[PDB]
Amino acid sequence: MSTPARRRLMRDFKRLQEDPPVGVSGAPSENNIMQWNAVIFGPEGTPFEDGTFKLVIEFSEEYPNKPPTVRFLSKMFHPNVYADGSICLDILQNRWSPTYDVSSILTSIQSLLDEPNPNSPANSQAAQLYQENKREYEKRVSAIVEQSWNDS
């Protein structure tokens, strides 16, 4: 049966694919469509600049009516980001609105690496090591960005 959800996401896809952003991409799964797979690099000047990170966008049938949740498929270290591979971002909670598009969703997560949101220390460890052991932070980011290159 025709599903309006499915139709919306395939339109959104077509829009993103005719009008693509830079330093992020996103596409659906191969067979599933409630689950998209998306990618980000660090912008210039970040400790992440070379390294590439892999995400999934998790949608609902009441879409974009509910916030599209996001997961991190790859290991991620950031104070806004769970070990559980999820994103605390305030617009992805009660502050969402059906105005943000697939580019907008991803470009936020890119700039979030350059500028974390200290109003929400999701994993107090990451925020702790920022104030405490910034040199360990620098180590871990080189290591986590390095893990990107595990296929060569």
UniProtKB/Swiss-Prot annotation:
Q: What is its EC number?
A: 2.3.2.23
Q: Indicate the residues that form the catalytic site.
A: 88
Record key words, sorted:
ATP-binding, Cell membrane, DNA damage, DNA repair, Membrane, Nucleotide-binding, Nucleus, Transferase, Ubl conjugation pathway
Q: Which GO terms describe its molecular function?
A: ATP binding; ubiquitin conjugating enzyme activity; ubiquitin protein ligase binding; ubiquitin-protein transferase activity
Q: Does the keyword Cell membrane apply?
A: yes
- Catalytic activity annotation: S-ubiquitinyl-[E1 ubiquitin-activating enzyme]-L-cysteine + [E2 ubiquitin-conjugating enzyme]-L-cysteine = [E1 ubiquitin-activating enzyme]-L-cysteine + S-ubiquitinyl-[E2 ubiquitin-conjugating enzyme]-L-cysteine
InterPro entries listed in its UniProt record: Ub_conjugating_enzyme (IPR050113), UBQ-conjugat_E2_core (IPR000608), UBQ-conjugating_AS (IPR023313), UBQ-conjugating_enzyme/RWD (IPR016135)
The residue ranges of the UBC core domain are 4-150
Q: Which SUPFAM superfamilies match?
A: UBC-like
Q: Sorted alphabetically, which PROSITE patterns does this protein's record hold?
A: UBC_1, UBC_2
**Gene Ontology cellular component list:** chromatin; cytoplasm; HULC complex; nucleoplasm; nucleus; plasma membrane; replication fork; XY body
User: Tell me, what does this protein do in biology?
Assistant: E2 ubiquitin-conjugating enzyme that accepts ubiquitin from the ubiquitin-activating enzyme E1 and transfers it to a E3 ubiquitin-protein ligase. In vitro catalyzes 'Lys-11'-, as well as 'Lys-48'- and 'Lys-63'-linked polyubiquitination. Together with the E3 enzyme BRE1 (RNF20 and/or RNF40), plays a role in transcription regulation by catalyzing the monoubiquitination of histone H2B at 'Lys-120' to form H2BK120ub1.
User: Quaternary form?
Assistant: Interacts with RAD18, UBR2 and WAC.
What is the name of this protein? Ubiquitin-conjugating enzyme E2 B
Organism expressing this protein natively:
Homo sapiens
Record gene name: UBE2B
